[PDB]
Design a protein around this nucleic acid. Structure first.
Lengths: 71, 177, 116
RNA sequence: CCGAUGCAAACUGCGAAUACCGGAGAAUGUUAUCACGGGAGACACACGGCGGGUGCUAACGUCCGUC
RNA sequence: CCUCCUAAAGAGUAACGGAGGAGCACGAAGGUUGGCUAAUCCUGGUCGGACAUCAGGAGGUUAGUGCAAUGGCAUAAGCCAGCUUGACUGCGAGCGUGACGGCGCGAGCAGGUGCGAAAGCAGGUCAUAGUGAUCCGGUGGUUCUGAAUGGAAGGGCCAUC
RNA sequence: UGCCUGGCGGCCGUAGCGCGGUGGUCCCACCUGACCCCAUGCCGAACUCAGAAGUGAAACGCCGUAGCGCCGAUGGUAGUGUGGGGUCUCCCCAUGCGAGAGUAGGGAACUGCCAGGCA
């Protein structure tokens, strides 16, 4: 018988993000951290070093990993 | 050990002669005998279960572990996590001695000894049976009997068909049905 | 299921060590033989591998698999790593238990003077 | 309820155009871009096209996103 | 204050729009090591037949993970045994948003801890709601200052009911 | 440099599911007892101690089986940005981008390094 929250990917592939930048703040884990990418308590992927952002599918389950390569 | 030598000497030889395999251990082997109770009457009293568990520990060489309930249904008035039964697992010398002691003295003395029930199989080779009057076993005496309880003994069979289980049961001549 | 469970359990540390990208020392223990490999961060090349099956170190060993054989493999790996310049690789137990031959091999490797 | 056939705003084993972010590039555009400072104005908008909600899927009825 | 749509595959975008729940809880349901990890269904059991329990199998995350609801979750973010309190103090590059008050994530440094052989982990709880700003009143520290001097009354900031 | 076996990565159904056959030279697996290092929320259940005493039972390596499953064209089809038109609730015209599914076709995977037996 509220206020929308901000979701989705903030930094896409090819962006030369800085260390600590939040690539994606999602509900749970839509994508998994790979190389030089962390995972916060709230399941937030944040960059660890300067470089370009890439998304790659790997693993038997075909899960997408967010990774950072040298700039 | 004590009975495995005679097993390999005679039972394996007879079964090999009967079935004409190639591998020496092609005859399926028993791993463990699981001692269990289908009493299902300890719901009201926990002391009954405690005494039965003490009896199981006394008869066997090791004490049992209390097992909790799996599901809760309102129709049968059962909650989740309710401790009702327990099991004992044996594998090795303890099992060999238990089987020898059973098949030597305990099996013959059964009231209404019309034979075993070969039809009571799992359909894949395992044979599980349950009989009352645990008093028959010698480890339990008449002066220390609380109530009549049923048993549940399931022999382990690695075969893929019931013919191998039938042969293994007949190994001890399977007195009759 | 034994091999699958072992591999699944080892995969935890196997992936954990990959984030920091350091050379890893893994040990595969079998009653017949024991093997110890040093794997680069890439994961496709091994800097140095030692095995009990080869006769280079099995001549003085009565049997290929035992505590003495594990110690010999550990010391051989340690000396080879010293002369190669591994620079303090990390260690992995491959999902085994660090109480028996694995512990003996680790102690033998650390005896040479390693800092892992 | 067993299998099959059609169907959907709090249905997708697949999946467009369009929109959004970033990188590289010829051409054009009076820098049209960004930052700071002075000064503002305005704070009941109307109508029409495009795709929907609402409405009795009757209304030159009603509200939305774009132009 | 949170759980999906109308909302036209970035975010956002309507009418007491369609929908409920939290306004808690765990001081253990926190951290660390080892190992384990189904649900469901066929079949045997004194009744058990699936439905009060156990073991031989099909099946691999449909069970669960404290909640109304939601995503992702078997290297389970579960579930047995172990040891403790990192739910510690000063902090903190960068990032996500906001009109502000601010909120959240966060690499990493200094002190000293628990789990470990080490690698390393721990700045509370799998997460999204679960709370209180301003003013006022209660307590501890500070001579920081004190209307001549030394005190004191009264103020200023630190913890905080 | 060829066959076979294990370990470490990429690839994640062209790696999978079902069926028949082959592997003890080496390697791998089944296991005895554990009073000894270690332990069971009971069980030597799992890990640890001594191998060929026997074997390839089961798992696993390989060949065929295209039966199931997977990928996968060209083309067409639906859709759609832009400008216009009509009988304007809906459709069409010129242009650009282009579905899913299925068909042809493939495949019973491939590749990098180390170790060991036979050549």
């Amino acid at each position: 018988t509220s206020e929308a929250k901000r979701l989705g990917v903030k930094r896409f592939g090819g962006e030369s993000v800085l260390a600590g930048s939040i690539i994606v703040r999602q509900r749970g884990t839509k994508f998994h951290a790979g190389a030089n990418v962390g995972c916060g308590r709230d399941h937030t992927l944040f960059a660890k070093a300067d470089g370009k952002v890439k998304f790659e599918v790997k693993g038997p389950k075909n899960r997408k990993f967010i990774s950072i390569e040298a700039e | 050990a004590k009975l495995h030598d005679y097993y390999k000497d005679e039972v394996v030889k007879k079964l090999m002669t009967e079935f004409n395999y190639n591998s020496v251990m092609q005859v399926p082997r028993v791993e463990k005998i699981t001692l269990n109770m289908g009493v299902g009457e300890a719901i009201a009293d926990k002391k009954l279960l405690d005494n039965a568990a003490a009896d199981l520990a006394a008869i066997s060489g090791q004490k049992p572990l209390i097992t909790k309930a799996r599901k809760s249904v309102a129709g049968f008035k059962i909650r989740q996590g309710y401790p009702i039964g327990c099991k004992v697992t044996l594998r090795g010398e303890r099992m060999w001695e238990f089987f020898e002691r059973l098949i030597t003295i305990a099996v013959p003395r059964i009231r209404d000894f019309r034979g075993l029930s070969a039809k009571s199989f799992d359909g894949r080779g395992n044979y599980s049976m349950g009989v009352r009057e645990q008093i028959i076993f010698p480890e339990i005496d008449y002066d220390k009997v609380d109530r009549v309880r049923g048993l549940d003994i399931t022999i382990t069979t690695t075969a893929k068909s019931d013919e191998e289980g039938r042969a293994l049961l007949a190994a001890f001549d399977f007195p009759f049905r | 299921d034994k091999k699958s469970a072992r591999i699944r359990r080892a995969t935890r540390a196997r992936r954990k060590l990959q984030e920091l990208g350091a050379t890893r020392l893994v040990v595969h223990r079998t009653p017949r033989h024991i093997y110890a490999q040093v794997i680069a961060p890439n994961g496709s090349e091994v800097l140095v591998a030692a095995s009990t099956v080869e006769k280079a170190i099995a001549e003085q060993l009565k049997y290929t698999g035992n505590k003495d054989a594990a110690a010999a493999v550990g010391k051989a790996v340690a000396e080879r790593a010293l002369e190669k310049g591994i620079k303090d690789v990390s260690f992995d137990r491959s999902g085994f238990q660090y109480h028996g031959r694995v512990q003996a091999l680790a102690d033998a490797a650390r005896e040479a003077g390693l800092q892992f």
